[PDB]
Each structure stands twice: as C-alpha cells, then as structure tokens.
C-alpha cells in the first residue's frame, strides 16, 4: 500500500495513545460516507461492549472508502478537537509528493 | 424445488433491496410458527450484530415450515407494510396453477 | 410438552394481539415466584428499550416455574383486567382431563 | 435505491448540521404513521440518553414507511419551522421526473 | 385490532390538533377506571414536565381498559366540552356493525 | 439464605398488598443506615416516576445492611403504623431458633 | 383489598360528584390521625393550587391509617354535613359481614 | 389551527403590551364559561403572585372553550374598556371568510 | 455553524456571568416566537426548581427559531436592561460581513 | 470521611427527631455561606412541598462548605434555640483531637 | 496458584451467597486500580443486563492486579459493609505463612 | 461406565424435555467446581448463540468432575426448581447398591 | 500518558473522597468547553439517576479537551470552593518540568 492516504492509516495504528479521546457516537452523524449497515453495527457494539472497544472498528471501517481523510479532519474540527485535526493534516501532507 | 411456495422464497433472494425495511424484532411476536429455539437465537444475533445482518437468518429460518407465506403476508399487513404485503401476494398467485 | 399447563403457554404465543395491554412494571410486585435476578433484569430491559419489547421476556420467564397459571390469573384480576383473566381461565380448563 | 423519496433521506444524512434543531418529543404526536411500539421506544431513548442521540433513530424509523415526506413537511410547518420545511420540499421536487 | 373500540383510539392519534385542549388534571377524578398507580404517575409527570407532554400518556393508559369510550364521553360532557364529546360519539357509532 | 433476617424479606415480597401504604419520602429520614448515595437516588426516582414504583427499590436497598429489621420496626411505630409494625415483629420471632 | 374499610374508599373514587363540597382546610383540625408532615403539606397545596385540586390528596392520605372511616364520619357530622355523613355510614355497613 | 377563532388568540400573544391593563379579578364574574375549578385556581394565583403573572393563565384558560371571543368582547365593553373591545372585534372579522 | 446568528449564541455560553440577571418569567410574554408547549414547560421548571436552573433552558430553546436575536434585543430594552441589550447588539454586528 | 467536621454531620442524620424544629425560612438569611442558587432553590421547595421535606435539603447543602459548623451554631443561638446549639457544640469538641 | 492472594479469590467463588449484596456501581469509584477500559465496560453491562450478572465480571477483573485484597477491604469498610470486610480479612491472614 | 454417578448423566440425555428450563447463566455462580476456563467459555457461547444451544455444553462439562450430582441438586433447590431437584435425587439413589 | 495535564486526572481518580461535594448542575454553565451534546446528556443523567452517579461522567468528559485544568480551577473558585481549587492547582504544578 504505497499510497499517501493508506499510509496515513498506519500512522493511527502506531500512535493510538493520542486517538483514544475520539467519541464514536457523537462523530458518527458527521461522517456521511458510512453506509446504513456500517453505521448501524457500530452503535450495537457500543451498547454491548464499552466505548474504546469500538474505536478499532470505527477506524478500520473508515479507511475502506477513499477520500476519508478529508471527512475525518472536518469532523474533528467541528467537534472541538482542533489540536488532533491539525496533527492529522500535517501527516497527510508529509506523504503526498 | 418446483413448488409454488418454495419459488416465492427465490423471489425474496433476488429482490433484496425492497425487503430491507422489515424490522426483525417487531415482527417476531406475530410469527407463531417459529420454535422457542428459533425465536431465541434471532434476538441474540440482533443484540450482537446489527439489524440487517439478521434479515438473512429470519428469511432462511421462515421458509423451513410449510405454509409460511400466509403468516408472512398477515404480519406485514398488521405492521403498516401493506405495500410490501400486496407485492408478495401477487407473486404467490403467479406460480400457483 | 403434552401437559395442560405448558399447552396454555402456547395459547399466549399464538394469540399475542390480546395480551399486549399487560403492563410489565405494575404486575411485577404481584408475581412472587420470580427470583431476585429475574425481577431485576426485567426492570433494566424496560428502562433501556420500550415496554412491549419486554412482554416476550416476561412470559418466557414466567412459564419456567410450575404453577404459574394460578398466580398469573390472580394478578390479572387484581389489576382490573378481569376480561383477560376469564379468557385464560377457560383455556386452562380446556386442556385438563 | 433509485427512488425520489429514498434519495431525499440521503440528503438528510449528508446535511445534518441544519437538522439538529428538530425536537423529537414535540413532533412525535404529529406523525401518525409511527406505530405504537415505534412511538414508545423513542420516548424511552430520550429519557435515558440526551435529545440529539435520538435524532438518528427518529429519521431512521421515519423513512421505513412510504409517503413519509409529506407528513414530515406538514409537521415542520405546524411547529414554526417553515424555513426548514421549504428546504426539504424543494429537494423533494428536484428528484421527481 | 379489528374492534370498534380499539379503532376509535386510532382516530385520536391521527387527529391530535383537536384533542390538545383536554386538561389532564381536572379530568382525572372523573375517570374511575384508572388504578391507584396509574392515577399517581400521571400527576408526577404533569409536575415535572408540561401539560401537553402528559396528553399522550393519558390516552395511552386510558385505552387499556375495555369500555373506556363511554367513560371518556361522559367526562367530556361534564367538563363543558360538549362539542368534542359529540365528535367522539359519532365516530364510535361509525364502526359498530 | 437460611437466616432469620433474610427470610423476613421474603415475607414482604410474598405479601405486598399490605405493605403498599408505606410512604417512601416520609420514612427516609428515620432510616440512618442508608448511605448518602442510596438516600439520594430514591428521591430522584420518586420525582420522576410515581410513589409505588419506588417501594420495590426501598425494600431491595434496605435488606442489604444487616440489622435492618430493628430499624424498620422502629420507624413504622413512629409514623403511626403500629398495626403493620406488630405484624413484622411477630414474623421476625417466628424464624429465630 | 377485600376488606370492608378499603372497599369504602373505592366508593369515594367512583362517586366524586357528591364529595366535591368537602372543604379541606376547615376539616383538617378535626382529623387527629394525620401526622404533622401530612397536615403541613396539605395546607401548602391549597395555597399554591386551588381547593378541589387538594381533595384527591386529602382522601388518598386519609385512607392510609386504619380506622379512618369513624373519624371521617364524625367530622362530617360536626361540620353541618349530616346528609353526606349518613350516606357514608350506610355504605360502611353494606360491606361488613 | 386554521380557524378564525383560534387565530384571534395568536393576535393576543403577539400583541401583549396593549392587553396588560385587563384586571383579572374584576372580569372573572363576567365570564360564565369558566368552570368552578378554573375560576378558583385563578384567584389563588392572584393572591400568591402578582396580577400580571395571572394574565397569561387567564388567556390560556379562556381559549379552551369555543365561542370565547363573544364573551370576551362583551365583558370588555361592560368594564369601561371599549377601546380594547373594538380592536378585538375588528381582528375577529378579519379572519372569517 | 458558520452563521452570524448562531455564533451569537456561543457568545452567551462563554459569557454567562453577565446574563444571570435575566428573569425568565417576566420576559416570557415578550417573546412571541415560543410555541405553546415551549412556553408551558418553562413555567413548570421555574416552579419545581429555582430560577437560574431555567436560564439554560430558556436560551437553548430560544436559539432554535431563526431571527431570535432581534426579538431578544427588543425584549431586553423594554424590561429596563438597556446595558445588556447594547452589548448583544454590538456582538451581532461583529459577525455579519 | 475521618474528619471532625464531617463526622458531626453523621450525628445529625442519626438523630433527626431533635432537629425537626429548625425552621428553614427564618434561618436562611443568617447563613451567608450559601450561594445565590442554593438559597433560591430552597425557598422554591418550601413553597411547593411542606417545611420538613426541605430539612434534608438544607442540611445536605450546608455540609458542602467547610467551616459550616461555626455558622450553624451561631445562627441557632440567635434564633432562640440555645438548647440545640449547646448540644451541637459539645458533639463538635468530642471529635477534635 | 499456590499464593496467599490468589487463594483468597477461590474463597469468593466457593462462597457466593454472602457476596451477593455488593453493589457494583457504588463501589467502582473506590477501586482506583481498575483501568479506564475496565471501568467503562462494567457500567455498560449493568445498564444492559441486571446487577448480579455483573458481580462475576467485577470479581474476575479485580483479581488480575496484584494487591487487590487491600483495596477491596478498604472499600467495603467505607461503604458500611464492615461485617463482610472482617470476614475477608480473616481469610487473607489464614493463608499467609 | 457401570458407576452410579455416570449412569445419572445418561438419564439426563434420554430425558431432555424436562431439563430445558434450566437457565445456564443464573446457575453458573452456584457451581464452584467449574474451572475459570470452563466458566468463561460458557458465557461466550450464550452471547453468540441462544440459551438452549448452551444446555448441552453445560451438562457435558459438568459430568467430568466426580461428585457433581450433589452440587447440581443443591443449586436446583436454591433456584426455586425443587420439583426438578427431587426427580434427580430419586434417580441417583435408584442406582446406588 | 506522560503529560502533566493527563496525570492530574489520575489524581482525581485516586482521591475521590474529597471531590464528592462538586455539584454537577451548578458548575455546568461555568464550563464553556463542553459541547451542546455533552452538556445535554449530563442533565438527563442527573434527572434519571442521582447526583453522585453523574460525577464520574462529568470528570471523564471534562478531561477529553486539552486545557481543561485552567477552566476547572476557575469554576471552583467562583463557586465558593477555594479550598478544593488550591489543592488542584498545587498538584498541577507538581508535574510540570
């Protein structure tokens, strides 16, 4: 996977301590790329298990659709997480030629 | 399977886009042909996974018992799904000699 | 299950439209056969989901203990549901030799 | 889902910032298409969680019944939300041939 | 629910604009069919929330007991709401064979 | 639970019709064994729901602390409920060796 | 509640039109069975709301203490309400074996 | 509420500065449509709080009974408020077809 | 929410110390945009809890309807709060292009 | 809570019969440590419910601020309750090392 | 597992009737050794299922971290469960050499 | 397997209709002979599949440890299943010499 | 989490006995960093459950946004909790290099 967008996902996996504050439920309505099935199973997981057990499923599902980085950055800014959004944006431009 | 009732089940499999609005949980009490084990495992699946992941299991289990079309049509009418019920009834009479 | 009491439970499953007005919460204190765990989980379900989603769990739990029909009839009479109580009593005597 | 009415629902999902002011509780009595079970579980969710956590459940439940757009527009006008009602009506006619 | 009395309740749900003037508190003493628990929780709801938020709970609770239409009509006449009482009485006779 | 004090609690569960007149709010200050959290949640329940919906929570919470029978009897006598207090005292001595 | 005294209370609930002339404030000093808390909250309700809004609270509180019928009859006679007192006394003897 | 009489009530809500001189107590005897409970609670409110705090309750209660505009106009003329009465009468005829 | 009117609401949330003197009850009649349900629940909250506990509910409800800033400024001037009204007006023009 | 001041609060909870004569309203102006919100909600509770229903809220609110025992003793002496004030002072010194 | 601390856990498993009164929710804040994920999933389980269904998960999670017996004893004493705390402490010293 | 205890297990296999009411989850804490691995996998099965699909695994696992009949009988009595417990006890003594 | 601000949160978790007097409702308006959804769900929890059951949710939500310590200290000083505010400030400087 030698693409700029896919390599951003590997950054999240290697740095998980600073992405644990993302709340799954509040950010779901602001990600329109997720399908009806994908957006329904995530809420079921959060009801059964905890919240941080769903974080892996959210990120794993998000990266499937191309162009997910732009939507992820926009959602973080609108949910008062500007510090995290700026960090992701800098990493995205570090890989594009 | 050259029977009128079995051939109705093949219609559901080929046309799944218009049967995705059937809610599994609300329609379960109105299907008395399902056994205690069959009606218990379906609720467990809906709690673990999503709702649409259970739709295949509901239809696959329903077709086992003969005479399931009449009960399926009656349940759909009583749950404010008359448009879907009329579609299934027309297909049922299209195969009977 | 060729017993008179168990066959009464099958009557409830097949005729659910006329048993939907039974309120779970108000009738719980008048059913002393339910255990502490059984009576605690039912209230949790009613708080999370709706009321009619709990009706199946109440009837499924009630039939486990033998002699539950007499307690069910007595509770219905004491909660101003005499019409439903008389219907169940007639069905109970229709199966006893 | 290449239907005019279903494609209106996708507009709501993609534009959620301007539909967050719809109050679930006050608009429920003005939507007669919702069933007794559907109208009961929504109030339970609003009591347990917040109000905006119920907005997704309201819209997801509403779109199941065909012809829900006409009832949704009428309710919005009667609840002093004419600006939002006009926006939805224009989108509805943008898809009909 | 193909009964004359139950079908009257569906009329109230579909026509809510003309039943919003019924005051819950003043009409409670004139409905003797309500139980002690049912009549106690309604007053608690009116103290916490508003008055119109209780209207749904009053009608939902009233329809559980059979023969509630006769008591509802009598209470409306005695509370200077004869215009509303006559409307309900005409609907009741429109369904009886 | 083959203890004299625990077996008294089972008497209350089986005979609930004669313990429905105990007012939760007035008797709370006279039960010093309840903790600050336990005494705070009970008042919240009485404000939201009715009064008899709290009776189960009061008795379920009371039996956790050993020696609760002596405090319960004393509170009943001081609140002009001597007839109920004498009934409980007789049951308590019926189980002690 | 198959007791003679409790069944008298159900008579009051079913016949409320002829018990609306009982003034709460003037009859309170002549009911010594009411506790200090019970007699204090009733006056607060009469000051905030009207007078007939307190009638339900007076009767609901009165029936908690056994032997309340004898005190109620005596108070009615002493407040120039002999016609109402005779009606209640006849009902009381209609249930005693 | 697309009725001529109901739309008159919305005029009062939007123009409150010119309806603040209506005295609640003096006009109550000249409104015979108010019930005994409704006419009793209004006087209790005026004794506890001020006078203008009762104006909202008077208008909110008055509009419940149909035909209240004719009685309101007649009372205003008889209490030396002819200027206000003429204003309301003109608005009433502005909505009737 | 990159709109001039919505951004004014965020100013109120961040500066709450200078908006605590707004009395909810006296300003309600001068805000005609509030619906009958919205204006009824606010008075119930002020009766149950204190006055400042209602301030959040008033501001949260007010911002739902567009054009609420003009009505809010006019009400403040008419209630002898000109100093607060001028502060809000200056902030409103600081965001409009 | 192994502090001298906190352990004094537990004395009040265990001995409530001798602290029931403290009038909430008259003693409020002599407790300057209470905040504006805390002093406003207490008066609302006394108007709605009785007086003794507020006693728990007064003591629960008072103990939050450290150094409340000295202010409580001073207020009791100034309100002609010297007998109660001396009892509390002796208990306070019984816990200090 | 021939360690003193691990062998204490086996005592709890074999004697479960006397550990059923431990409330999971109230004791969670007083166990700082639990991680954020561990303390979040327990509350989710208590909301979905009952309370006693969570007791096994609490004890199974607690024993993972060494030195959990000292924290467990301290929490029990501070929650008015001294009788249970003394029983556990005696068992702990019965295994240490 | 010509042993008295093993031959009791064959009775359960041949008579399964009368052992289907045993709830796996509630009876697990009362069977201390099960190991940590054995007690963990059973809960996983009940979450994935239904409840009756776990009954075979519970009985198959229980019979491995000698002396399991005494623990099984004791658990059944303590879970209000005395009728089933007496049946098993009689069978156990039917095989011992 | 080797950051000065995150390590302050661990201090609160380990020392909960001295942070139990923080009232959730009164301090919410003085924390502008909380979002509209976050500030709405907290009030719903306080209405359903008690007050101390919400304390964990308040602290867990607060720590998500960076720079929350400065706002927390300022709110505590303004709510007459200077003793607690000074304790937190000293801990904050104990971790900064």
CA distance I51 to B55: 51
- Nearby residues of I2 by Cβ (< 8 Å), 6 or more positions away: none
Asked if the Cβ–Cβ distance from G56 to E29 is below 8 Å, we say yes
Chain I, nearest residue to M71 by Cα: I14
Q: How far apart are CA M19 and CA M12, in angstroms?
A: 7
Say how far apart CA D63 and CA D85 lie, in whole Å: 16
For residue J21, give how far its alpha carbon lies from the nearest alpha carbon of chain M (Å): 26
- The alpha carbon of residue G17 is apart from the nearest alpha carbon of chain F, in Å, by 26
End-to-end CA distance of chain I, in Å? 15
Spell out a b/e string for J38-77, using b for 16 or more CB atoms within 10 Å of the CB, else e. Answer: bbebbebbbebbbbbbbbbbbbebbbbbeebbebbbebbe
How many angstroms separate the CA of residue G51 from the nearest CA in chain F? Answer: 22
G30 CA to chain E: closest CA distance, Å?
Answer: 25
Which residues from E are below 8 Å from D when comparing CB atoms?
13-14, 16, 53, 55-56
- Provide the token pair at L42: 């059973």
What would the DSSP string read from start to end of A19-39?
A: STT--HHHHGGG-TTS-HHHH
CB atoms within 10 A of CB F91: 16
Q: Within 10 Å of residue M20's Cβ, how many Cβ atoms?
A: 14
Please indicate whether, in this complex, the C-beta atoms of A23 and M65 are within 8 angstroms of each other. no
Q: What are phi and psi of A38, to 5 degrees?
A: -65, -40
Q: Rounded to whole angstroms, how far apart are CA atoms H94 and H87?
A: 11
Q: Do chains D and M touch (3 or more CB pairs under 8 A)?
A: yes
From H49, H50, H31, select the one nearest H39 (Cα to Cα).
H31
Q: Could you write out the DSSP letters of every residue in D37-83? A: HHHHHHHHHHHHS-STTTHHHHHHHHTTSTTHHHHHHHHHHHTT-HH
Give the alpha-carbon dihedral of K21, K27, K32, K33, to 10 degrees.
20
- CA-CA distances (angstroms) from residue D89 to D10, D73, D76, D84? 14, 7, 11, 9
Q: Are F84 and F18 in contact (CB under 8 A)?
A: yes
H91 in Cβ contact with H8 (< 8 Å): yes
- Here the contacts of C39-44 (C-beta below 8 Å, separation 24 or greater) are C40/K50, C40/K51, C40/K52, C41/K49, C41/K50, C41/K53, C44/K47, C44/K48, C44/K49, C44/K50
Report the candidate in H58, H62, H81, H79 with the shortest Cα–Cα distance to residue H70: H62
d(CA I39, CA I27): 11
DSSP state of H21: T
Q: Alpha carbon of G59 to those of C78, G22, K41: distances in Å?
A: 21, 11, 48
CB L8 within 8 A of CB L88: yes
Tokens of G84: 């109402």
Comparing CA positions, the residue from J2, J65, J54, M20 lying closest to residue F37 is: M20
DSSP string, B40-81: HHHHHHHHHS-STTTHHHHHHHHTTSTTHHHHHHHHHHHTT-
Query: Which of F14, F16, F55 to probe by mutation at the C interface, max C CB count within 10 Å?
Result: F16
CA pair distance F40, F36, nearest whole angstrom: 6
Task: Using CA coordinates, name the residue in chain E closest to I46.
Answer: E48
Tell me the C-alpha distance between F94 and H70, whole Å.
73
What CA–CA distance (Å, rounded) separates H43 from H54?
9
Residues 6 or more apart whose Cβ sits within 8 Å of residue H52: H20
Q: C-alpha K76: how far from its chain's center?
A: 9
Min Cα–Cα distance to chain B from A30, Å: 20
Q: Structure tokens of J56? A: 């728990």
Gyration radius from chain A CA atoms: 13
Which of E47, E48, E52 is the closest to I37 by Cβ?
A: E52
Taking the C-alpha atoms of residue G84 and residue B23, their distance in angstroms, rounded to an integer, is 58
Cα–Cα distance measured from residue D79 to residue C21, given in angstroms and rounded to the nearest whole number:
32
CB A57 within 8 A of CB A42: yes
CB contact under 8 A, K32 and M53: no
- Beta-carbon separation of B41 and L47 below 8 A: no
What is the Cα–Cα distance from G76 to G84, expressed in whole angstroms? 7
Q: Using a threshold of 3 CB pairs under 8 A, tell whether chains B and J touch.
A: no
- d(CA I62, CA I6) in angstroms, rounded, equals 11
Chain B interface residues facing chain L, Cβ-Cβ under 8 Å? 36-37, 40-41, 44, 48
The one-character DSSP state at G72 is H
Chain center to CA of J57: 10
d(CA F21, CA F18): 7
DSSP K46-69: HHHS-SGGGHHHHHHHHTTSTTHH
3-state SS class at G15: coil
Handedness of CA H10, H11, H17, H22 (dihedral sign): negative
Best CA proximity match to D34, nearest among D5, D64, D12:
D64
User: Do the Cβ atoms of D79 and I1 come within 8 Å?
Assistant: no
Please tell me the experimental approach by which this structure was elucidated: cryo-EM
Q: Return d(Cα I69, Cα I92) in angstroms, integer.
A: 8
| Residue C46 half-sphere exposure toward CB, CA atoms < 13 A | 16
- How far is it, in rounded angstroms, from Cα J70 to Cα F55? 38
Chains that touch J (3 or more CB pairs under 8 A): F, G, I, M
Query: From F37, which residue of chain K is nearest by alpha-carbon distance?
Result: K26
- What are the CA-CA distances from residue H27 to residues H62, H79, J7 (Å)? 12, 8, 59
Read off φ and ψ for residue B19, nearest 5 degrees: -115, 15
* C25 CA: distance to closest CA in chain K (Å): 15
Q: From residue L81, how far is each of K8, L43, L86 by CA, in Å?
A: 31, 22, 9
Q: Which chains touch A (3 or more CB pairs under 8 A)?
A: B, D, K, M
Q: For residue C86, give the H/E element and its range.
A: helix C82-93
If DSSP states are collapsed to H, E and C, what string results for H25-89?
Answer: HHHHHHCCCCCHHHHHHHHHHHHHCCCHHHHHHHHHHHCCCCCHHHHHHHHHHHCCCHHHHHHHH
Q: Residue G35 and residue F26: Cβ atoms within 8 Å? A: yes
Answer yes or no: are the C-beta atoms of F20 and F72 closer than 8 Å: no
Q: Tell me which of I49, I54, I55 to substitute to probe the interface with J (most J C-beta atoms closer than 10 Å).
A: I49
| Cα L36 to chain centroid, rounded | 17
Taking alpha carbons only, the member of C65, C81, C63, C90 closest to residue C27 is: C81
Mutate to test the interface with D, among E12, E13, E45 (most CBs of D within 10 A): E13
Is the CB of residue F19 less than 8 Å from the CB of residue F55? yes
Is residue H51 within 8 A of residue H23, CB to CB? The reply is: yes
Q: Which residues of A fall within a CB distance of 8 Å from B17?
A: none
Closest CA of chain I from J52, distance in Å:
17
| Token pair for G41 | 């909250």
**What are the Cα distances from residue M66, in Å, to E28, J12, J72, M34?**
53, 42, 41, 12
D66 closest CA partner among D19, D33, D97: D33
Let me know if chains H and L touch, i.e. at least 3 Cβ pairs under 8 angstroms: no
C-alpha A88, offset from chain centre: 10
Which of M49, M54, M55 to substitute to test the interface with F, most F CBs within 10 Å?
M49
**Six-digit token string for B67:** 């005479």
Cβ-based contacts of B17 with chain D (< 8 Å): 1
Between chain G and chain H, how many beta carbons pairs sit less than 8 Å apart? 16
Q: For residue D23, how far is the Cα from the chain centroid?
A: 10
3-state secondary structure I18-68: CCCCCCHHHHHHHCCCCCHHHHHHHHHHHHHCCCCCCHHHHHHHHCCCCCH
CA–CA distances in Å: residue B57 to residues A24, B62, C53, D94: 28, 8, 20, 38
Phi-psi region of A31 (alpha: psi -120 to 50; beta: other; left: phi over 0): beta
By CA distance, what is E30's nearest residue in G? Answer: G16
Would the CA dihedral through I32, I34, I35, I39 be positive or negative?
negative
Q: Which of I14, I55, I56 faces M32 most closely, judged by CB atoms?
A: I14
Pairwise CA distance, residues G50 & D9, whole Å: 50
Q: How many CA atoms lie within 13 A of C97 on its CB side?
A: 2
Do M41 and D53 lie within an 8 Å CB cutoff?
Answer: yes
User: Touching H: which chains, 3+ CB pairs < 8 A?
Assistant: E, G, I
For A66, residues 6+ apart whose C-beta sits below 8 A from its C-beta are: A5
CB pair distance less than 8 Å for C37 and L21: no
- The residue count for chain M: 97
CB atoms within 10 A of CB H2: 8
3-state secondary structure of G46: helix
Q: Are C34 and C28 in contact (CB under 8 A)?
A: yes
Say if CB K88 and CB K18 are below 8 A apart.
Answer: no
Tokens matching residue F92: 């308590």
Which residue from M80, M30, M22 is spatially nearest to M51, judged by alpha carbons?
A: M22
**Chain I residues with CB-CB distance to J36 below 8 A:** 52
Distance from C-alpha of M54 to C-alpha of M41, rounded to nearest angstrom? 10
Alpha helices, H only, K1-97: 4-14, 24-27, 36-48, 55-62, 68-78, 82-93
CA atoms of E57 and C46, how far apart (whole Å): 16
Counting Cβ atoms within 10 Å, is residue C57 exposed (0-12), middle (13-18) or buried (19+)?
middle
Residues 6 or more apart whose Cβ sits within 8 Å of residue A51: A23, A24, A25, K40
Q: Considering only alpha carbons, which residue of chain J is nearest residue G47?
A: J47
Handedness of CA D8, D12, D13, D14 (dihedral sign): positive
Cβ-Cβ contacts under 8 Å for G90 (sequence gap 6 or more): none
Tell me the shortest Cα–Cα distance from I10 to chain J, in angstroms.
23
Chain centre distance of CA L9: 9
The secondary structure element, H or E, covering residue A72 is helix A68-78
Rounded Cα gap, residues F30 and F73, in angstroms: 11
Query: What residue in E sits closest to I49 (Cα-Cα)?
Result: E48
User: From residue A15, how far is each of A8, A9, A18, A88 by CA, in Å?
Assistant: 11, 10, 6, 11
The two three-digit tokens of residue C88, written as one number: 């169940």
């Amino acid at each position: 996977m030698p693409f700029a967008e896919d390599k951003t996902y590997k950054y999240i996996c290697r740095n998980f301590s600073n992405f644990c504050n993302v709340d799954v439920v509040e950010i779901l309505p602001y990600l329109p790329c997720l399908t009806a099935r994908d957006q329904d199973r995530l809420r079921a997981t959060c009801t059964l298990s905890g919240n941080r057990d769903t974080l892996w499923h959210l990120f794993n599902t998000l990266q499937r659709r191309p162009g997910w980085v732009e939507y992820f950055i926009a959602a973080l800014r609108g949910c008062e997480l500007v510090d995290l959004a700026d960090e992701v944006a800098s990493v995205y431009q570090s890989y594009q030629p």
